[PDB]
Swiss-Prot record, chains A, B:
Subcellular location: Nucleus, PML body; Nucleus, Nucleoplasm
Gene Ontology BP terms: cell division; cellular response to bisphenol A; cellular response to gamma radiation; cellular response to stress; cellular response to xenobiotic stimulus; DNA damage checkpoint signaling; DNA damage response; DNA damage response, signal transduction by p53 class mediator
Active site: D123 (proton acceptor)
Subunit description: Homodimer. Homodimerization is part of the activation process but the dimer may dissociate following activation. Interacts with PML. Interacts with TP53. Interacts with RB1; phosphorylates RB1. Interacts with BRCA1. Interacts with CDC25A; phosphorylates CDC25A and mediates its degradation in response to ionizing radiation. Interacts with CUL1; mediates CHEK2 ubiquitination and regulation.
Residue span relative to the full protein: 211 to 512 of 543
Stated name of the protein: Serine/threonine-protein kinase Chk2
UniProt-reported outcome of changing Y103C: In prostate cancer; uncertain significance; somatic mutation
Coiled-coil portions: none
Organism listed in the record: Homo sapiens (Human)
């Protein structure tokens, strides 16, 4: 059975998805509104995630409504009726380039916001991008902060004299503080897949190991599929899939890239925004 | 003033040392015995250190007796009347090679024990090696676990498919799990200094940066001083001061090194051991 404290406030309903975590539809008794409830079976992963989720406040980042610590973990969140981005791209399905742009722009904003706030997601992928409605033009939100990391001991070590300090520590100074680039790489992969309908790196019809494809950065380019796609878009992908994390495009550089200087897309986003907001906008001093 | 709960059990006495932390002599009321009390001015560093200290049990590792969380932190420990190894090597003072060996052997045991127990010290140096008495032949103990680290997310990342995984993460797999080598490097530096009376790497009478001396591994070799020293000893130093952490000697390899196959030194250690133990040895089934 469900915990009594949960049952007190919510009527549990259908399973929306499972599950490595399960997500169920629920109704908040007080409002009769739909919510999502994530059930994580029984720890530190979760308190981190909760505390991270509580502190974050961005339109393209999932918001937590309630939390229950019981025989299992129960996280109550705003419902994303549109489901996973995964479903929109599975089986070589592919979005209009312009839909890619609208989605990708939001992802970039979300991840930029995470980075400004010292948080690295570390598990960005189509299954962790949720759509807010069943419309093709909607708001997206990043979810699943279980692998996240809060961005040191290196700095403290550097404050003193290295008399006893190991060489590898001094060598790590060259690259320290670029952990956030892993998110930009993932975003690069996600965008590749959204644009093209297929994975840049995979074991499909190739003898190169997955590992070797990735560390060499030799993605699978299929001209016939990409010919349909603009060159501005493909150019952005190529700057995200840079092997050297110090050279890789950051979220800011990506947001300043020509493919995203598109005022039509940006208007549509601001629209969906104010649209979502209307129901909760309190009056204000003019 | 000192906390009432501390004062209740101990009479505070002279400052033994300060302090970046301060250490005072104290007397336990109940036994009238001398203890040391470390005063760390006001956090996570400390709970870690305490919990680490509570769990460890080795003759060459400092033992905690009591702890007080107040306006400041108060750690009560067994008193080391011999003071810091630092004092024995400052101003080009140098120990008989045989004293070096006895000391170094204990350090190796201590650090080997830490590594077996998933703990990396990360701040080994002569000021964190304490002597148990004023005798030249005594027991040594490692102290100061404030920078320690408990030895992953890499493993968890490797369990899945790297479809979205960044190149630098896959590249880090080659060297993952060798963090403990930093302790062996430090031990190498400490042994160099003990044997020779001077630092392997420093800004003294040289134009090479300290950083460059370390990452290149070009220690300062002065034949006149080292001529006095055996070649077995210098050979061990050279295997500890290896730049590549994967090639660097571990504690086990160091303990198996010819310089430490010395049954006379080992007897003297077992003696000091049973000697320390005599006062607390309970009777036992024959
Ligand atoms: C509409 O249909 C669906 C709605 C969904 N809503 C949320 C959802 C998750 C939140 F954290 C917050 C609000 C939400 O709506 N999460 C789903 N699934 C997750 C997302 N990460 C992977 C996956 C897994 C394995 C955990 O089940 C949904 C899957 C659906 O169909 C498969
Ligand atoms: C006998 O004279 C001395 C005894 C000492 N005993 C302990 C001591 C520390 C413990 F953690 C446990 C038992 C002990 O005895 N620690 C000292 N000093 C520390 C060691 N790390 C650096 C240094 C500093 C900066 C913290 O003061 C002593 C310094 C002395 O003279 C300078
Ligand atoms: Mg979540
Ligand atoms: Mg200590």
């Amino acid at each position: 059975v469900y915990p009594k404290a949960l049952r007190d406030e919510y009527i549990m309903s259908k399973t929306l998805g499972s599950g490595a975590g399960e997500v169920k539809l629920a109704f908040e008794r007080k409002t009769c509104k739909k919510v999502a409830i994530k059930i994580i079976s029984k720890a530190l992963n979760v308190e981190t995630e909760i505390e991270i989720l509580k502190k974050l406040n961005h339109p393209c980042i999932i918001k937590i409504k309630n939390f229950f610590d019981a025989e299992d973990y129960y996280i109550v969140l705003e419902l994303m009726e549109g489901g996973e981005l995964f479903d929109k791209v599975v089986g070589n399905k592919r979005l209009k380039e312009a839909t890619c742009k609208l989605y990708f722009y939001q992802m970039l904003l979300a991840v930029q916001y995470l980075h400004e706030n010292g948080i690295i997601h570390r598990d960005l992928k189509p299954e962790n991008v949720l759509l807010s409605s069943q419309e093709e033009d909607c708001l997206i939100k990043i979810t699943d902060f279980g692998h996240s990391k809060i961005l040191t001991s290196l700095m403290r070590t550097l404050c003193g004299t290295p008399t006893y300090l190991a060489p590898e520590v001094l060598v790590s100074v060259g690259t320290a503080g670029y952990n956030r680039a892993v998110d930009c790489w993932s975003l690069g992969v996600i965008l590749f897949i959204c644009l093209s309908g297929y994975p840049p790196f995979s074991e499909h019809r190739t003898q190169v190991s997955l590992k070797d494809q990735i560390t060499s950065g030799k993605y699978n380019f299929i001209p016939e599929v990409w010919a349909e796609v603009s060159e501005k878009a493909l150019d952005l992908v190529k700057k995200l899939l840079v092997v050297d994390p110090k050279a890789r495009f950051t979220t800011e550089e990506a947001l300043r890239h020509p493919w995203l200087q598109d005022e039509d897309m940006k208007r549509k986003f601001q629209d969906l925004l104010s649209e979502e907001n209307e129901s909760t906008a309190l009056p204000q001093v003019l």
